[PDB]
Point group: C2
Chain length 51, copies 2
Amino acid sequence: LIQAEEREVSARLAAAETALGESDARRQTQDAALEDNALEIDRLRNALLQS
Amino acid sequence: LIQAEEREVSARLAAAETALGESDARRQTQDAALEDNALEIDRLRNALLQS
């Protein structure tokens, strides 16, 4: 009966480990684009401003 | 001997909701700035072109 309660935990283990990495890694997939566009933005800043 | 591992993992999962959530809370802090870079491009485009 104590064993069964941990059967709930294994999913709580299974989900979180999935819920943890696959988003934090996902965030880096989002993270790079920020500076990617921002650096484009910075030249996009002075472009008119130099023109 | 069960109370050895069952306690820790239960506690180990006790972090999980704090583990996901603040990281989950981060994801909002992703999206807000996303448009700011995005929304400026057209103004950063047009101004180079309306000039």
